[PDB]
Amino acid sequence: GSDLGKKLLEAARAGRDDEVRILMANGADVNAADVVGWTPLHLAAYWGHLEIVEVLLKNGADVNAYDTLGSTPLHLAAHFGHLEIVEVLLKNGADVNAKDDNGITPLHLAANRGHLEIVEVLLKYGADVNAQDKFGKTAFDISINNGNEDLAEILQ
């Protein structure tokens, strides 16, 4: 596709908000994907760069882009405790029950790292509380296994 594709992946990767605007403006493919299938929105979501997430979404970035293992930007934001990104992704239409190749959902991941504020927002937006991964496990099983009583309360 584009040389600016790769520059945008790199700039989103490294949190360079200004370099990201300038590249958006010059036609850089907003859904350019690297070798593992990560888009700028994936990278910005994983590394916690909120402004870049926002700029990209406004420029039409595919909110539900999936990587080669089926994981979406919301999987990454939920897993790495980035609350304000989780909220924006879900507001711009992120699929709250997206499953990866393993059947893992953003809820499973937030639950596993005990990100409680994130777990609440996911349930706010309709996250399926009884979704099973390929092993039969729910967010509730994950709370029991990790002995995280606060998270057990929240999932009843």
Partner: protein
């Protein structure tokens, strides 16, 4: 220059964090009671390599330093993983540079670099090691290993795994004491005395191919060649070397302390002349460096492969061999090697010039050549490629409070972003190391493995042995002891989907695929972890702006450094100590 000792260890198939936390930390923690130590630095990388460099006070006797470091390392050896102990952990004086680099090439296209490396190992290196005034000699490549390249589909067909393969090779490529008939103490009057000779080490691909893995219930035999391809090959494949586009190996030769350079160089050249009658066809000796060699760095992006780097190095070689045909004798292209990082995405070209007197005029001097090379290489896409001939400062950012790699990177980026705000005082303030890159995280599900009766050892040996390789034991090749390695044939260990082609046998004999008890995902992590005086570190280089002193640049770095998050410290090293 202050004397330095380097400890080198290798853990095949290990990632940077595995190496650090099972080797590097353990060794660092045992570097006490050593005299005259100024500082210690280490790096641990994704090629399974650790290097710990100890730097001693100027005037320290380097041999005493070496021996003290050695003894402490050797006492710590039982604390290290078996796989690392079996590779040898070397402790060498690292301060000195090469007397000469000797290239060994094949010109008539009959021999791979592994063939050549083996020839050198077996016929050349030892006679060079014993030559007058020679010290350390490094081989560039290895002697052959017997390579067993496994096929998962054939293994699953016959309900076998890599574990069965490794067990069978230990059992059938063996050599043990069997005693004697009529040995002492004997029945008195015994006339017959003879050694008993039982199994002996295997000597060839044919013999390995006949290893019996299993007799089926129908009475058919499964032999090792039915689940694997079998060849003599390299111990490892991280480096590809060419000399003017031809396959190469070589020797890196060091001068013994208090020996003469010119007499040693002539004594080596003489010794190498004696061997020339015995070469096979087209083997040839070349001398890329001997007491105007410059270098060209090649750096591809995160995740880039050996083949992509090779393509770029090939463009670099072709350029010097055509656009500088009047100036350039040779290009020695080393794919997988850099200073500041090994890996599939780096390489370095050693360019050797023709004589001063055959390059008249300033256009044909090194400085003009290098600037032209750099201008030409600037229009290669998706590679940074820099020609250079071999002031600054050397800073270490230090994790002082158990912050972890991720928080240390964020502090590093806080300092680098601040140093950029003062271009009046500082320029080119940059990491010396590497950035985190995508990695494939596989979780084994312990409950599923238990339910199914799949053992975790079987799981982890199957994954490790197939995808990383395993040094099983030794064999004898044309009378010389050499290693035996099991690994997946390349096309079954390339991509995530290949993980599910590998099967493990449960306790009830059913074959279970990897996907039944595992899940995976992409994440970032480090391909090269750095430590300084036993603590996690990130080295940062830089220089004073124009018309400012190094001392002034340092003062600002310290001041910027005082504003970093809690638990982040620093120290000055190297040129800046």
């Amino acid at each position: 220059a202050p004397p330095a000792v380097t400890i080198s260890a290798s853990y095949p198939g290990a990632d940077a964090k595995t190496v650090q936390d099972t080797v590097t930390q353990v060794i660092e923690q045992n570097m006490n009671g050593i005299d005259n130590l100024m500082y210690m630095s280490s790096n641990s990388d994704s090629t399974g390599t650790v290097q710990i460099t100890l730097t001693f006070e100027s005037g320290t006797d380097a041999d005493i330093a070496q021996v003290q470091v050695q003894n402490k390392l050797q006492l710590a050896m039982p604390l290290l993983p078996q796989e690392v102990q079996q590779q040898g952990v070397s402790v060498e004086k690292s301060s000195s540079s090469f007397l000469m680099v000797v290239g060994v090439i094949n010109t008539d296209g009959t021999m791979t670099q592994e063939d050549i490396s083996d020839y050198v190992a077996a016929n050349m290196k030892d006679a060079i090691s014993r030559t007058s005034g020679v010290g350390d000699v490094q081989l560039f490549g290895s002697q052959y290993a017997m390579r067993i390249w496994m096929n998962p589909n054939e293994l699953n067909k016959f309900q076998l795994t890599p574990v069965d393969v490794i067990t069978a090779i230990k059992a059938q490529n063996a050599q043990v004491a069997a005693g004697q008939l009529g040995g002492t103490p004997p029945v008195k009057g015994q006339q017959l005395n003879a050694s008993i000779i039982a199994q002996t080490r295997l000597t060839s691909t044919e013999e390995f191919g006949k290893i019996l893995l299993k007799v089926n219930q129908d009475g058919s035999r499964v032999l090792l060649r039915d689940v694997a391809k079998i060849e003599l090959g390299g111990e490892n494949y991280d480096i590809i070397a060419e000399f003017n586009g031809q396959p190469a190996s070589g020797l890196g030769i060091k001068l013994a302390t208090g020996a003469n350079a010119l007499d040693t160089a002539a004594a080596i050249r003489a010794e190498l002349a004696k061997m020339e009658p015995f070469f096979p066809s087209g083997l040839k000796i070349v001398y890329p460096y001997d007491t105007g060699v410059f270098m060209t760095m090649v750096q591809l992006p995160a995740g880039a492969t050996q083949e992509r780097t090779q393509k770029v190095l090939n463009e670099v070689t072709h350029y010097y061999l055509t656009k500088e045909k009047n100036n350039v004798e040779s290009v020695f292209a080393v794919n997988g090697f850099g200073f500041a990082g090994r890996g599939q995405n780096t390489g370095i070209a050693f360019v050797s010039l023709k004589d001063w007197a055959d390059r008249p005029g300033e256009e044909n001097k090194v400085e003009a050549i290098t600037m032209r090379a750099t201008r030409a290489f600037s229009q290669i896409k998706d590679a940074m490629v820099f020609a250079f001939n071999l002031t600054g400062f050397d800073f270490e950012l230090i994790d002082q409070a158990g912050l972890g790699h991720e928080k240390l990177t964020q502090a590093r980026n806080q300092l680098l972003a601040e140093a950029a705000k003062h271009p009046d005082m500082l320029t080119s303030v940059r990491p010396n190391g590497l950035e985190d890159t995508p990695q494939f995280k596989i979780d084994i599900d312990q409950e599923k493995a238990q339910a199914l009766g799949v053992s975790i050892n079987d799981i982890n040996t199957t994954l490790g042995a197939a995808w990383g390789g395993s040094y099983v034991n030794d064999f004898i090749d044309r009378g010389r002891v050499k290693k035996v390695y099991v690994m997946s044939e390349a096309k079954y260990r390339m991509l995530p989907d290949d993980i599910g082609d590998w099967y493990v046998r449960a306790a009830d004999g059913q074959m279970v695929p990897f996907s039944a008890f595992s899940s995976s995902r992409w994440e970032y992590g480090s391909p090269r972890l750095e430590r300084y005086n036993g603590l996690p570190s990130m080295e940062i280089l830089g220089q004073a702006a124009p018309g400012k002193s190094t001392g002034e640049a340092m003062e600002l770095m310290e001041q910027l450094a005082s504003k970093l998050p809690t638990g982040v410290g620093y120290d000055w090293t190297g040129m800046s100590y």
